[PDB]
Design a protein around this nucleic acid. Structure first.
Ligand SMILES: O=C(O)CCC(=O)C(=O)O
Ligand SMILES: [Mn+2]
Length: 267
DNA sequence: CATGCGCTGAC
DNA sequence: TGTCAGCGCATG
């Protein structure tokens, strides 16, 4: 009727250590209803009474060369972009169907889908096979086309470019991601200080200090969250997520406006 | 740079 | 016969 924290953490760390081939020191774990650590600089897990992981933070899982390489390219592409966000894969937003994102054909989407996602997906696989099996079991039940389009288990990738003193960015405003049917997987890039650009869970009073190469697995639909400002550097991050629509709404294999016309005549 | 089409939880 | 801001995406 109640899981003991000591044993569960021993198991999660054991599986993580063998899969990621690195030891996570000073790891901690807390039930979702309990008091959460105010500051997380090390491996961290939260869960419900049943023991399913609703949050997992693994520091520095990505290899240095990989993080550095993707950072230089991201910043290069983003310089030639206006908006501070981008999306690859599919989106159902504001439509009763899943559509291919506009960025996919652009330089950013091409980079994410063809180069980045295939490599990151392996680390997403490492991650889910450790902390949450139900998530990966669910993701593979989706349409074959999504996996092909985004070259990932997640149908959708969000690209967030946060420069200093930008308070207008959607990640700077406390929110839940309410269309999420599963916990998202987050990866960080760029360069910023470890006292800044942290992810704060507002209602849990918990600050996760995230750094390039770190991974964060958590439910955005349940736990309200916000990202702190940076005074220097450049904070770039990738969010792999799945909207409810991906399972429910139909898919016309085209962009938003085109998929809409097709939707009408489909009747 | 404001408006139209369109969805949806949070209130 | 509830309102509305907001991981889209244009058009002028
Ligand atoms: O950047 C982060 O750490 C969180 C971003 C996020 O929650 C989002 O993109 O909706
Ligand atoms: Mn979010």
């Amino acid at each position: 009727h109640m899981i003991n924290k000591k044993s569960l953490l021993q198991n999660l760390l054991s599986k993580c250590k063998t899969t990621f081939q690195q030891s996570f020191t000073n790891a901690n774990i807390t039930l979702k209803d309990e008091k959460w650590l105010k500051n997380v600089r090390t491996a961290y897990f939260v869960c419900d009474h049943d023991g399913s992981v609703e949050l997992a933070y693994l520091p520095n899982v990505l290899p240095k060369e990989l993080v550095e390489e993707f950072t230089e390219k991201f910043e290069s592409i983003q310089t030639g972009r206006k908006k501070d966000t981008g999306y690859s894969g599919i989106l159902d937003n504001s439509m009763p169907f899943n559509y291919v994102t506009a960025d996919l054909s652009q330089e950013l989407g091409q980079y994410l889908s063809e180069i980045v996602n295939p490599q990151i997906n392996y680390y997403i696989s490492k991650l889910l096979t450790c902390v949450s099996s139900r998530t990966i079991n669910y993701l593979v039940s989706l349409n074959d086309s999504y996996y092909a389009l985004n070259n990932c288990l997640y149908p959708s990738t969000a690209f967030n470019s946060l420069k200093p003193s930008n308070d207008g960015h959607r990640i700077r405003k406390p929110h839940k991601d309410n269309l999420d049917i599963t916990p998202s997987s987050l990866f960080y890039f760029g360069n910023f200080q470890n006292t800044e650009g942290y992810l704060e869970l507002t209602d849990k009073n918990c600050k996760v200090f995230v750094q390039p190469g770190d991974v964060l697995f958590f439910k955005g639909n349940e736990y309200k969250h916000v990202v702190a400002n940076i005074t220097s550097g450049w904070r770039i991050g990738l969010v792999y997520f799945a909207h409810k629509g991906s399972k429910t709404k139909p898919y016309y294999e085209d962009t938003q406006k085109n998929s809409l016309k097709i939707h009408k005549e489909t009747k």
